Amino acid sequence: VNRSTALLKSLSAERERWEKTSETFKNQMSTI
């Protein structure tokens, strides 16, 4: 089950990318 585990952890890192993007993006949503 380590193949799906590797897929899951890579997806979790890519989702970390998503939440950092959402943070900065609510930032300009605030300053608009």
UniProtKB/Swiss-Prot annotation:
Residues modified as N6-acetyllysine: 9
Cell location: Cytoplasm, Cytoskeleton
Recorded domain comment: Dynein heavy chains probably consist of an N-terminal stem (which binds cargo and interacts with other dynein components), and the head or motor domain. The motor contains six tandemly-linked AAA domains in the head, which form a ring. A stalk-like structure (formed by two of the coiled coil domains) protrudes between AAA 4 and AAA 5 and terminates in a microtubule-binding site. A seventh domain may also contribute to this ring; it is not clear whether the N-terminus or the C-terminus forms this extra domain.
Disorder noted: Charcot-Marie-Tooth disease, axonal, type 2O: An axonal form of Charcot-Marie-Tooth disease, a disorder of the peripheral nervous system, characterized by progressive weakness and atrophy, initially of the peroneal muscles and later of the distal muscles of the arms. Charcot-Marie-Tooth disease is classified in two main groups on the basis of electrophysiologic properties and histopathology: primary peripheral demyelinating neuropathies (designated CMT1 when they are dominantly inherited) and primary peripheral axonal neuropathies (CMT2).
Function: Cytoplasmic dynein 1 acts as a motor for the intracellular retrograde motility of vesicles and organelles along microtubules. Dynein has ATPase activity; the force-producing power stroke is thought to occur on release of ADP. Plays a role in mitotic spindle assembly and metaphase plate congression.
Similarity-based family: Belongs to the dynein heavy chain family.
Subunit comment: Homodimer. The cytoplasmic dynein 1 complex consists of two catalytic heavy chains (HCs) and a number of non-catalytic subunits presented by intermediate chains (ICs), light intermediate chains (LICs) and light chains (LCs); the composition seems to vary in respect to the IC, LIC and LC composition. The heavy chain homodimer serves as a scaffold for the probable homodimeric assembly of the respective non-catalytic subunits. The ICs and LICs bind directly to the HC dimer and dynein LCs assemble on the IC dimer. Interacts with DYNC1LI1; DYNC1LI1 and DYNC1LI2 bind mutually exclusive to DYNC1H1.
Protein name: Cytoplasmic dynein 1 heavy chain 1
Organism ancestry: Eukaryota, Metazoa, Chordata, Craniata, Vertebrata
Residues of the full protein shown: 3472 to 3503 of 4646
